């Protein structure tokens, strides 16, 4: 599915991301916009043989297992395929683990480059 902005904000809020580990909701909405364009089925292959999966583009070298990535660590203990569901539960649960790992939201390249340092509250304005 392709979420609307406020629709995703509300779902992310129900799943406990607002202010999670120090990151207000607009961070998570901005990250999804620029990672997946709000599409739960987005996928992107990388040079190291990994793939990024789903609404938050979770990576198969470190976080989810896709069975085809060298050096897999599966730190979210989840098949990557579950991260392509239209239900965001598995992606949120893994995102919570990622953002707790010690480098905050910097794991999300698009957030780091395109959201961090901007007024991210604008992403929930009008919702
Ligand atoms: Cl998989």
Q: What is the DSSP string of 42-59?
A: -EEE-TTS-EEETTTTEE
Buried b or exposed e, range 16-55, using 16+ CB within 10 angstroms? ebbebeebebbbbbbbbbbbbebbbebbeeeeeebbbbbb
Whole-number Å distance between alpha carbons of 79 and 67: 8
Between CA 127 and CA 49 the distance in angstroms is 38
**Helix H or strand E encompassing 47:** none
Q: Which domain holds residue 106?
A: 1-127
CATH number of the structural domain spanning residue 77: 1.10.530.10
Phi-psi region for residue 104, left (φ > 0), alpha (ψ -120 to 50) or beta? left
Query: Catalytic positions, please?
Result: 35, 52
Round to whole Å and give the CA distance between 41 and 57. Answer: 9
Treating both helix axes as pointing N-terminal to C-terminal, what angle do 25-36 and 5-14 enclose, rounded to 10 degrees? 130
Q: What is the dihedral of CA 114, 63, 86, 90, to 10 degrees?
A: -120
CA of 44 relative to ligand 1 center, distance in Å = 14
Helical ranges in the chain per DSSP H: 5-14, 25-36, 89-99, 109-114
Closest CA to 27 of 2, 56, 65: 56
Which among 17, 72, 102 is positioned nearest to 59, based on CA atoms?
72
- Give the resolution in Å: 1.2
C-alpha span between 15 and 62 (Å, rounded): 23
Q: How many domains does the chain have?
A: 1
Binding residue positions for substrate: 101
Rounded distance from Cα 110 to ligand 1 centre (Å): 23
Which residue do the tokens 């239209």 mark?
A: 86
Give the method of determination.
X-ray
For ligand 1, the distance from its centroid to the CA atom of residue 118, given in whole angstroms, is: 34
């Amino acid at each position: 599915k392709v979420f609307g902005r406020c629709e995703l904000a509300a779902a992310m809020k129900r799943h406990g991301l607002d202010n999670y580990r120090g990151y207000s909701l607009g961070n998570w909405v901005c990250a999804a916009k620029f990672e997946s364009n709000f599409n739960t089925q987005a996928t992107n292959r990388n040079t190291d043989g990994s793939t990024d999966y789903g609404i938050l583009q979770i990576n198969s070298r470190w976080w989810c297992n896709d069975g085809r990535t060298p050096g897999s660590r599966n730190l979210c203990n989840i098949p990557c395929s579950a991260l392509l569901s239209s239900d965001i539960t598995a992606s949120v649960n893994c995102a919570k683990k990622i953002v707790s790992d010690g480098n905050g939201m910097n794991a999300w390249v698009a957030w780091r480059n395109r959201c961090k340092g901007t007024d991210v509250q604008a992403w929930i304005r009008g919702c």
